[PDB]
Design a binder for these strands. Structure first.
Lengths: 73, 225, 36, 341, 134, 421, 116, 52
RNA sequence: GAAUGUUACCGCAAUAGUAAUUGAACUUAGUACGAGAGGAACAGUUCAUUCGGAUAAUUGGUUUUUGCGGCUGUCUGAUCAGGCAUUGCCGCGAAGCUACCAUCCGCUGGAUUAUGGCUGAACGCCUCUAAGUCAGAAUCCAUGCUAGAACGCGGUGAU
RNA sequence: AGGGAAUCUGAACGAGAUUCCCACUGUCCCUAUCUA
């Protein structure tokens, strides 16, 4: 049972398989930037917590999201 | 004060009972001799509670507690929680704890001042043991044995660890607890020393297969007579 | 109790006639053995 | 298979008759020995278990129970049997002078075509100071070692579309044959309730014709089902009442509800009268007439002596899946709907 | 031997020839069942274990120290829908079992994941080496 | 194997042994064949019987051979102890006769089966089978003496004591009927007769006791004046890692001169020279100092009538054998008395409650009446726990009336506003 | 006795209905019917499927934040049973149910405005 | 195992049946016959409803 | 299934079959017994194994309710409806049927066998047997459990 | 714009054969239901 931050996931398909919990932490200024998006709303918050309940369509909701976060970097 | 008894012909006392300074918790077995074993030695002074957790006899290795408080896991029903509150005096608090882990007797090894915990426990309970029990909390390992409760007997007077504990680990760990520690056994060389005996500041109850050379060590380190 | 199987007293014709042949055989032996 | 349950053939009728009766003590008060109803229903109960010595002492157990519908049985006669070297022999039966439409229906296979002229001359035979009826009742009291009660069911108070009630014979285990025949005299045209035969924590043996499966293929081919089976030692969990609302209420649940599920039982109606909630599963299907006898003998173990403390009655939808106990809890959880507002 | 009190019927999910995971920190990762101790006997029926039943099982993927010897194994995770007396039917994620001596004493020092309620009740020393129950 | 041997399958007296093995081959094998069958089934019939009786005798013989302890392979004390109690040569002669007889029976069975596959009639085949089992019977009839010996040795070795040559031992010696029987009588729980004659005791009686948290065993002995009973004592002194407690009677009792005890002590001196001797007294006084001339001896004066000095002898023996922040305690516990089991006046436990209420598994413990409440009229708790789809315990708090009235204020703040039209 | 919530629906799970599922992580997934259980097995988003309550909360077809809904808390610190403190709850629960029903009805009116 | 018709178990169960085991059934029977006697009076009141 | 007036209801039971099985768990116990190592049994209660009789409250399974929905193709000139696909394919799924893959239930009195006995002859002792006599196996026969003789019978309703 | 690895046979082979490793399945444990 593994736990990492979302920011650790961004900087790296291969990540999501071994993982169970990505964590939301508001104290980082980086997450405050990621909060102010058209993403990170509408179903995305619960999708973070339960990674093995998802399926293919909700994996692509994150794999599209990572590239949005990489372009901000 | 070292009493030697059994529950339904079982030497593992700590599995089927939790005994502290202010209360004693017993399982409802068919044989009442285990309840009468404590009622002989403790009388009507400290309350002996006929109790279950989640409909399990295995109470002592499922619960945590000292003179100030009592912790039960998630699986405790509201009827059992009602029953424990009714039976107990108002000096002792009761709180149900929601966790990854449910065997609290294996996770919270404590006395009235100190506490040892599992290294992988959540932060919420770490700040709840500090409040309800009012004791110092340490994520400490006993010689690579990750479960602190079953492999460490503990009191305000002294403690007892399993014989595989290193000398370096004895000195380091007794520095944390501030009590003298001796590596010993129970029930003729059983390594499970936490569930092999229940203890407080004035009584030590072992199983009927604990030999006298071991029993003298128990009496010595807990400083009864 | 479980009452076990009873032996018959019906002597079959093969038994009865074979009894006669065995009897007459015992005669022919006894007449020879009388001479020695 | 089991060589005792042979010949494995179709029964004589749906109403299987009770083969043996509980003994007799000639000092006990007069009381019925067997009762009948209509089995239709099955449901889940939880209870805390006060069965000492068990792994579940002071714990809670979920278990399956069956609901037989039992309208108040009505007495319409009495039979007296003499003890012979040939068995028993009925010498005299006596009836109730004025019987229901249901039983005069039982006497015909085609009800509508008949002039309904059943007990006309028998009721006219009564029509005086008695004289012949009291003569036949003297005939029963003088002889007749055992006395059995003719009863019938209240079929109309049951949701069944049958209209035709079942006659039965129920012996009496109350001593002094005089008190047997005179209990009967006090009970012509009258009805007998369920809880005047049974109560809670009582073992019974429910007898039923076992759910017909038709033709089937030494392990031999032929008939499967529709056999008259006696199953013994089913504990009565609850005796109920029709007029009394909150039958589904326990000591714990205490919500005003009937044990009847939402939209009733499957293939059978609600409950509008007295019932027996018996533990386990009684033979036969729903809509099936069962005859409940009582134990034959003193059958006391701790499975017969213990008191049942019923905690909750499942009244969720058996037709479909179960999510709500009351209709009130469906539209409380749901919110308000389209056709509501 | 070892089992405390009576033992009641729960559904059978692990027959002979089933590979379950190993849960203690002894060294083994998986376990292959070969025989079930205290089972019924039909014609043609395989011996089927359940949660909290001592089976004779061999290590297939683990340390060579734990191999070379067929040893007792108590099943702690079932993953087949058994029934509790408190209403619910439940099942786990995977089949798992822990290795012990014939007396019922554990070789490992801690058991990973959830341990079944019935298994922890019957076997005391499994509940001694338990992190999670239920 | 180890210390003792009670677990031996019994030894039949060679006549009954025949009546066991031969009757079993009559009961367990098929017994009825016609002469009119095929020759192959006649052959296979009698072959099956010769072989089955073969396995029969061999099974019984193997039980004897594996059962009895391999005398010269066990332990030097036991090798010699059995040699004293039984004629060791004859003990090996007897077991050699069984090992011989088993190989004989094996040879007979293997012979007559091989001879049996050539039988031409049922008569010839019958004569060969009768020949086989009769020959086996003759072999077992030649064993009437060694098996009669083996039953007696089985019975008497089955009752022999278990001494451990690796635990801390202490031999108890002296002249026969000095008073050493009273010593072991008053040190432990072992019934040894103090009958007023010479050889009362006939073997090595053992007594266990515990001192300084350790297992001790004191071995009583018959005594030394040579006999099988007498040599048993001497070899117990010789082969056991022990200390010897030679006892002396400085009195008119025993019926032997103290000078003869001096002569015997200095004569048996060589074999207990390595064992660190203790001597206990239960011109004239000078000849006790003649006993003191031995390198390793100590002298003590004691009386068996008093129970202190008998214990002190033990203390010195065991001592020779070893060298060879504040806790929380409630005052309700401190003020509480101890539980005396034979007291007419004490509190009744739940154990006595269930007996008075009748039975162990029939009494249901009331969980109620044992818990603390404000009013004991509501002790018999019902507690609903569920009301209409939602469980009570989730809704259950203190100050729910004030919290409800807060929601009642939140009613009237939405009542006049006009949300319900 | 406990009346639970379905992990998919958030519908009332009565004792002796549906299936509890336990992970290797060991948390409880109680279900009310095999409709919800197979919906979970298929690894679906509940909040996407319309017939669940998880959808109706986030989409706001029903109410989420309310003072009546804050009293259905998973409560932990236990009470010593007062006859009065239970008699008050029996009428409190029947009261809060009435108010919650009237508030939800008002929420449905405030949502269904602008259709007439 | 002892059979269903094992003589000693039948005698041990007869030791039971002369104690508590019958007495509870002989109290239950009295409560059943009581309510049966109560069932006459109700019907007699409904006789007097029409007789009124 | 004709027949024994017809016809209907309630019955009786000759006869024939028959069924339960084994394991251990808690007290009784760490007592009897034991140098120690160890270590019982009856009475009380609790489960399970095999076998049988059932039953579908729930779980799982199952679907020409082809119930609803989705996909692929194909026709009405396009939407919607579907025509259609050797049941085109996919998801869920009621009712029904169903699984130690589910759940429930499965007995108590006499007569005996081996054996242990009582009184007691034969035989001026004795002797369990000869005349008598008590106990005593999972045995037998009953109770219970299944069919009802269609040429066994009975009682009762209807002119 | 079904695998993979060896070996026996005439380095890949050839629907050659055998053995093992991995995956799969009502062949079975243990059958259950539906359609023609």
């Amino acid at each position: 049972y593994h736990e990492t931050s979302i920011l650790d996931f961004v900087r790296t398909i291969s990540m999501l398989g071994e993982m169970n919990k990505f964590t939301i932490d508001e104290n980082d200024h980086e997450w405050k930037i990621l909060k102010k998006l058209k993403q990170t709303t509408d179903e995305f918050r619960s999708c973070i917590e339960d990674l093995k309940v998802l399926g293919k369509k909700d994996f692509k909701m994150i794999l599209r999201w990572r590239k949005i976060a990489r372009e901000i970097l | 004060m070292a009493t030697r008894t059994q529950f339904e012909n079982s030497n593992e006392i700590g599995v089927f009972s939790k005994l502290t300074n202010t209360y004693c918790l017993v399982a409802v077995g068919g044989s009442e001799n285990f309840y009468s074993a404590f009622e002989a030695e403790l009388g009507d002074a400290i309350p002996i509670v006929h109790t279950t957790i989640a409909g399990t006899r295995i109470i002592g290795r499922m619960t945590a507690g000292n003179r100030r408080g009592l912790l039960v896991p998630t699986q405790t029903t509201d009827q059992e929680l009602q029953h424990l509150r009714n039976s107990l005096p108002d000096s002792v608090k009761i709180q149900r704890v929601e966790e990854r882990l449910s065997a609290l007797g294996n996770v919270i090894c404590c006395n009235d001042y100190v506490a040892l915990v599992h290294p992988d426990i959540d932060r919420e309970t770490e700040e709840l043991i500090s409040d309800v029990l009012g004791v110092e909390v340490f994520r400490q390992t006993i010689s690579g044995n990750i479960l602190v409760g079953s492999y460490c007997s503990l009191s305000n007077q002294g403690g007892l660890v399993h014989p595989q504990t290193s000398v370096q680990d004895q000195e380091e760990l007794s520095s944390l607890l501030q009590v003298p520690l001796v590596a010993g056994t129970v029930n003729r060389g059983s390594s499970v020393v936490g569930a092999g005996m229940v203890v407080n500041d004035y009584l030590a109850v072992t199983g009927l297969d604990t030999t006298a050379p071991e029993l003298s060590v128990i009496e010595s380190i807990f400083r009864l007579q | 109790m479980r009452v076990r199987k009873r032996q018959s007293r019906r002597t079959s014709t093969k038994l009865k006639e074979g009894i006669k042949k065995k009897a007459s055989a015992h005669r022919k032996k006894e007449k020879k053995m009388a001479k020695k | 298979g089991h060589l005792g349950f042979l010949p494995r053939k179709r029964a004589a009728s749906i109403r299987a008759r009770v083969k043996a009766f509980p003994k007799d003590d000639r000092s006990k008060p007069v009381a019925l020995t067997s009762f009948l109803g209509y089995k239709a229903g099955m449901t889940t109960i939880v209870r805390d278990l006060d069965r000492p010595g068990s792994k579940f002492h002071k714990r809670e157990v979920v278990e399956a129970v069956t609901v037989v519908d039992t309208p108040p049985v009505v007495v319409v006669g009495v039979v007296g049997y003499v003890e012979t070297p040939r068995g028993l022999r009925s010498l005299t039966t006596v009836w109730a002078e004025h019987l229901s439409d249901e039983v005069k229906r039982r006497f015909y296979k085609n009800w509508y075509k008949s002039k309904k002229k059943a007990f006309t001359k028998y009721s006219a035979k009564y029509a005086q100071d008695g004289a012949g009826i009291e003569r036949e009742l003297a005939r029963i009291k003088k002889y007749a070692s055992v006395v059995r009660v003719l009863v019938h069911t209240q079929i109309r108070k049951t949701p069944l579309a049958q209209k035709k009630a079942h006659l039965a014979e129920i012996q009496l285990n109350g001593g002094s044959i005089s008190e047997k025949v005179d209990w009967a005299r006090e009970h012509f045209e009258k009805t007998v309730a369920v809880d005047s035969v049974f109560e809670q924590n009582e073992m019974i043996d429910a007898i039923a014709v076992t759910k017909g499966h038709g033709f089937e293929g030494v392990a031999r081919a032929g008939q499967r089902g529709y056999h008259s089976r006696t199953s013994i030692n089913h504990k009565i969990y609850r005796v109920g009442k029709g007029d009394d609302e909150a039958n589904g209420a326990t000591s714990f649940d205490r919500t005003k509800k009937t044990i009847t599920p939402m939209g009733g039982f499957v293939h059978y109606g609600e409950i509008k009268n007295d019932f027996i909630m018996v533990k386990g599963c009684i033979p036969g299907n729903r809509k099936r007439i069962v005859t409940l006898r009582k134990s034959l003998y003193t059958n006391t173990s701790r499975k017969a002596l213990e008191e049942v403390s019923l905690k909750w009655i499942d009244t969720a939808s058996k037709f479909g899946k179960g999510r709500f106990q009351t209709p009130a809890e469906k539209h409380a959880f749901m919110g308000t709907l389209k056709k509501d507002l | 031997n070892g089992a405390q009190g009576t033992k009641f019927r729960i559904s059978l999910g692990l027959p002979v020839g089933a590979i379950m995971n190993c849960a203690d920190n002894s060294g083994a990762r998986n376990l292959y069942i070969i025989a079930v101790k205290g089972s019924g006997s039909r014609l043609n029926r395989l011996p089927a274990a359940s949660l909290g039943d001592m089976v004779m099982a061999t290590v297939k993927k683990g340390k060579p120290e734990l191999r070379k010897k067929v040893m007792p194994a108590i099943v702690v995770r079932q993953a087949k829908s058994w029934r509790r007396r408190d209403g619910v039917f439940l099942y786990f994620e995977d089949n798992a079992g822990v290795i012990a001596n014939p007396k019922g004493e554990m070789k490992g020092s801690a058991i990973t994941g959830p341990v079944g309620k019935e298994c922890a009740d019957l076997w005391p020393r499994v509940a001694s080496n338990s992190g999670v129950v239920v | 194997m180890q210390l003792s041997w009670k677990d031996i399958p019994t030894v039949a007296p060679a006549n009954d042994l025949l009546d066991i093995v031969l009757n079993r081959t009559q009961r367990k094998t098929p017994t009825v064949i016609r002469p009119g069958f095929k020759i192959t089934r006649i052959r296979a019939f009698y072959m099956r019987k010769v072989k089955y009786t073969g396995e029969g005798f061999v099974e019984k013989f193997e039980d004897i051979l594996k059962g009895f302890p391999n005398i010269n392979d066990v332990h030097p004390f036991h090798r010699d102890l059995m040699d004293t109690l039984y004629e060791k040569n004859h003990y090996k002669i007897s077991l050699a006769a069984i090992s011989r007889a088993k190989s004989l029976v094996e040879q007979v069975a293997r012979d007559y089966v091989r001879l049996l596959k050539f039988g031409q009639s049922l008569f010839q085949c019958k004569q060969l089978k009768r020949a086989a089992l009769g020959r086996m019977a003759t072999i077992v009839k030649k064993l009437r003496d060694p098996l009669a010996y083996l039953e007696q040795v089985r019975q008497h070795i089955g009752r022999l004591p278990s001494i451990d040559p690796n635990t801390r031992t202490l031999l108890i010696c002296g002249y026969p009927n000095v008073g050493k029987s009273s010593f072991l009588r008053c040190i432990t729980k072992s019934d040894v007769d103090v009958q007023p004659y010479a050889f009362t005791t006939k073997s090595l009686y053992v007594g266990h006791f515990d001192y300084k948290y350790l297992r001790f065993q004191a071995i009583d002995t018959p005594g030394i004046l040579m006999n099988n009973i007498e040599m048993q004592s001497i070899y117990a002194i010789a082969h056991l890692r022990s200390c010897v407690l030679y006892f002396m009677d400085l009195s008119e009792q025993c019926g032997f001169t103290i000078e003869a005890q001096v002569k015997l002590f200095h004569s048996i001196k060589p074999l207990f020279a390595n064992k660190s001797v203790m001597v206990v007294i239960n011109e004239r006084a000078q000849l006790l100092e003649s006993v003191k001339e031995v390198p390793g001896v100590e002298i003590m004066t004691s009386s068996c009538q008093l129970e202190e000095n008998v214990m002190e002898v033990r203390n010195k023996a065991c001592e020779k054998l070893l060298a060879s922040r504040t806790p929380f305690i409630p005052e309700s516990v401190k003020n509480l008395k101890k539980y005396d089991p034979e007291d007419p006046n004490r509190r009744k436990l739940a154990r006595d409650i269930e007996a008075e209420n009748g039975g162990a598994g029939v009494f249901n413990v009331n969980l109620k009446d044992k818990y603390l409440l404000e009013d004991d009229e509501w002790k018999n708790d019902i507690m609903p726990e569920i009301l209409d789809g939602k469980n009570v315990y989730d809704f259950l708090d203190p100050e729910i009336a004030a919290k409800l009235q807060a929601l009642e204020e939140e009613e009237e703040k939405l009542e006049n506003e006009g949300f319900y039209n | 006795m406990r009346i639970y919530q379905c992990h998919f629906c958030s519908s009332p799970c009565y004792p002796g209905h549906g299936i509890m599922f336990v992970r290797n992580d060991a948390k409880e997934f109680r279900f009310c019917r095999s409709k919800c259980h197979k919906a979970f097995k298929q690894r679906r988003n509940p909040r996407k499927l319309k017939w669940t309550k998880a959808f109706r909360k986030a989409a706001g077809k029903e109410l989420a934040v309310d003072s009546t809904l804050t009293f259905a808390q998973r409560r932990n610190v236990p009470v010593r049973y007062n006859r009065e403190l239970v008699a008050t709850t029996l009428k409190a629960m029947a009261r809060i149910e009435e108010i919650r029903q009237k508030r939800e009805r008002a929420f449905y009116k405030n949502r269904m405005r602008g259709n007439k | 195992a002892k059979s269903l018709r094992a003589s000693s178990h039948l005698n041990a169960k007869s030791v039971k049946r002369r104690g508590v085991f019958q007495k509870a059934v002989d109290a239950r029977e009295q409560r059943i016959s009581d309510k049966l006697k109560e069932d006459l009076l109700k019907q007699k009141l409904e006789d007097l409803k029409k007789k009124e």
